[PDB]
Amino acid sequence: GVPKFYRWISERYPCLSEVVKEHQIPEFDNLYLDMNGIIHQCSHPNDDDVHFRISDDKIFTDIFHYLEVLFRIIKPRKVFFMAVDGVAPRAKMNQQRGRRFRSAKEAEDKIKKAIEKGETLPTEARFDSNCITPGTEFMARLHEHLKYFVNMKISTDKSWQGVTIYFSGHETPGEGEHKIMEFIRSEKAKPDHDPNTRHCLYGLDADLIMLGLTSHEAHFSLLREEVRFTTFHLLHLSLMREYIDYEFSVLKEKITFKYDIERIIDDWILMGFLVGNDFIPHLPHLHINHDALPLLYGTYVTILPELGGYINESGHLNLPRFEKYLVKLSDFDREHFSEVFVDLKWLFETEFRQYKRTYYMTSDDFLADQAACYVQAIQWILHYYYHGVQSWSWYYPYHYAPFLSDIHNISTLKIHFELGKPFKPFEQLLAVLPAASKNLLPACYQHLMTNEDSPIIEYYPPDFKTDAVVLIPFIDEKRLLEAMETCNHSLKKEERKRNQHSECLMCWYDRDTEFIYPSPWPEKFPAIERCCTRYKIISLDAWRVDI
Amino acid sequence: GVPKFYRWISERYPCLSEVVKEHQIPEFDNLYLDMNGIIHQCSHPNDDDVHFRISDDKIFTDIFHYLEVLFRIIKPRKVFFMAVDGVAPRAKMNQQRGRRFRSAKEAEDKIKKAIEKGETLPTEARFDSNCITPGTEFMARLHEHLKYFVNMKISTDKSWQGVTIYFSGHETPGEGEHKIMEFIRSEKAKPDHDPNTRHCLYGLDADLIMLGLTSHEAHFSLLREEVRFETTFHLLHLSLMREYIDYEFSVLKEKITFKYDIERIIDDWILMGFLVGNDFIPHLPHLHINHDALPLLYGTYVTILPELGGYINESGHLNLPRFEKYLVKLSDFDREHFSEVDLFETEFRQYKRTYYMTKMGVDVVSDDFLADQAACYVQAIQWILHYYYHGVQSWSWYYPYHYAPFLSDIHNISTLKIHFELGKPFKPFEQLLAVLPAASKNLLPACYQHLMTNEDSPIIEYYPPDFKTDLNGEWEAVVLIPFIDEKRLLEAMETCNHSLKKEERKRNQHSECLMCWYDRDTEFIYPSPWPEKFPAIERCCTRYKIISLDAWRVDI
């Protein structure tokens, strides 16, 4: 099984995506691995099975196997970068909240079902997959196991001894993807960067593909096992860049500025964002997804000549250009409306606008503001990909995108972001967790989620509608923080310790190093007698570039 | 521009369809040309100008020019097959009527508007495009000229020498494209047929794409000039399309119980294509060509294929159990569309009931009526598949409603018995009477005209001077005029057939495809079909064979 964006790409460009056995995998210099997928798979693979239980020792053992096998098979010759999600920008936090609410509700529903058929549950509580959020006790124990694992491998396995290993764990702010991109940019910025560096990124997900392309690195490949643990899906972005080039070649006869594959790829990326539902979803009945891309490509080819240049200029949205592209693309909405208007017969404008109005209600200045926020959202996402986070606090305050036909008068819109700063882990926990998960928090905060008189009780509804789109309130930053103030100094010692940001590690084997690395859990794993790891700690701001 | 379905596949498969200059057109063995679009283009290019007039010799000159240019540029090495539409199966009768009725209505509206502005029109009659129908005086004249043109070319132009020319004109029954397909099948039947034959089919229309694929020929391409007549051309290689589809569906390779076979997948792909509507069957409600509809069909196909014991379209024979399963799944489309606009089931039924009463003017929308709708639909799908794969299997069958059923009503069809009788093509005057409005009656022999005008004519109800047109839309107009019962038409006609004039009797018949070639030992005077306007061929070098009507028909 493969993700939708992957397959669609595959099908659009035959000859492109490959399936290859172990021995036919090429040589690679750098391997990037976002761990969150692995942690989920190793901790809760059988969510259908209300009876399934797994102990931490088994989780960690399993996480270890994944790293060992992936490393053994990809054999990165220069760099291995392991990332675990740290605290995310607010813009990502609404989606994180959604998933966590959905997840708790779905597991409680399944439990209730099992009970209704008179089944008897295990007595020990379930693994609450919502514990896979930066700053929880589970993530802290995991973090210690991963560090240990790296030290162990460095100290025992020759194949881990000639490589620079980076570990960016849950205390280092940013989603693992964003962290990987940040490291890729700093590498590109180093004066001797070899443009033929061979990168391998583990995964097939839409955001990974976009990440690999946004890098603009010549040789970038995504990889994943075919059968879920041997053959592997292998996607070469160098070929994909070539397929894209050939597809867009016709513009060489049409545009009066330089056709540049790198610039075309940037606009291709922007169009992929316009149809993505993985950030701001479109209304389900508009069928705006991957299948709409050919229409967006079509419209791009047609209009690019009148534009005078590209739309996504290395992450900077050209607003006049963008407005014209949208205006043209906006026909799509009436095409869809017309299927509905037909049924009504058994003036179009009055009917189309009252079609739109009816959806919005699920004011005139509401349109413009929603329009403006949407454009801001696009710029925010573009920044995230090309430049890194430009606002930790900004978010898109609606559950759905506006109708494209409603995005206009945006060409001189003023888009100013404040960088702000990441939440402390516990602020993050309260901003992403449902009351059903309250046990993941320190005691001193738990009542904010449960108690009828809590000042922010409305952010933790036990029941809510779902369309996935989870219909729950948007947290007001000031109210969340204000409410926590009164509780913060009731935090235990180990808890104040978890409530901190912490740095990325750079690690490598050294012939001239020996010390004792203590087991994170003595009963399950040995201490490292003779640990040969040399480390450099990377300062938090080290790879951040200012616009 | 290009047709919608072409545009669609161009967008779905982006490295499929090039625009090429003349000098880059590959070599072709066989060129197939259906002529009707050309004839319409040369006879009435400017319908918004109510003043435009054009003499027949001019129309013929321009047709000759179009043909000469396409032949020069494509230069088929082995075969050129030119077809004009002959009488069509009655399956097409409603749509042929629809176009001709609207054409006369639209012409009259333009004239009325010109006169409202105080314009004065030429006193000579405009060209009635309804005359482009088998067996008219205009089509018989044109036919004479096209035979003359073939002979002239063969006799004078070396690139027309050493190639076999076929001309299947308006007196040979069948739509041009399907006479072309019959030819292609007769070629494949031969022991020495070369699988590497390079075929070129002129045009970009959806039926042409489908026929190309239905041929299962390895190298078949479509071509049409980018701008109508340094010139550029759309070129679609079906070899490439086949590969693309092979990929789109290879995911199935592991999921299925039975042998994965690209040929069988193409069959099913072509079947799905029929669901968006054609000349023969109205489209399913809410299912038009665009981005979502089609992948939905194809996505559903991906999803459900594993569950079946095999393919749905088995070489042109519909597998009814499998087709049902498929439609049933696809129907989820209907509820989603409706949920936009168990209480639900009740409201949906009343939604659907309204459509059936309002659009098909039926009285009682019962389960039995719904089962009847389902039966008509599936028999239509099977008629079309026969038509593409085996050749027409009933000359009389037709779809009897102007609108299709809801996809959600098409069920309970698994064990349906589908029976067709071959019958035979109408004589051209029988089609001509059927398909024309009273405003074009002067194209018919005088002896039949009262049938379409007289208040006591037994078939007067078929020729309403006024009618409604559903004009929603891109989209195709639905013309709401009655379906002809051929038994009543033919009985009314027998009151008049024996009154035909001698020249008219000569046009009311079927006649054969011609096969023509340069022969060095041949020399004779070929007469001008119009002495005052075109010269005799003093040294005609054409040798020829008349191909009997049944020569390429296969009993199923």
Ligand SMILES: Nc1ncnc2c1ncn2[C@@H]1O[C@H](COP(=O)(O)O)[C@@H](OP(=O)(O)O)[C@H]1O
């Ligand atoms: N009014 C018109 N203008 C242009 N072409 C027309 C036309 N009516 C018919 N045609 C052409 O002639 C073909 C045969 O039409 P008919 O069957 O009514 O005689 C049509 O193919 P399609 O039926 O595939 O559109 C189309 O190519």
Ligand SMILES: [Cl-]
């Ligand atoms: Cl002869």
Ligand SMILES: [Mg+2]
């Ligand atoms: Mg035809």
Ligand SMILES: [Mg+2]
């Ligand atoms: Mg047809």
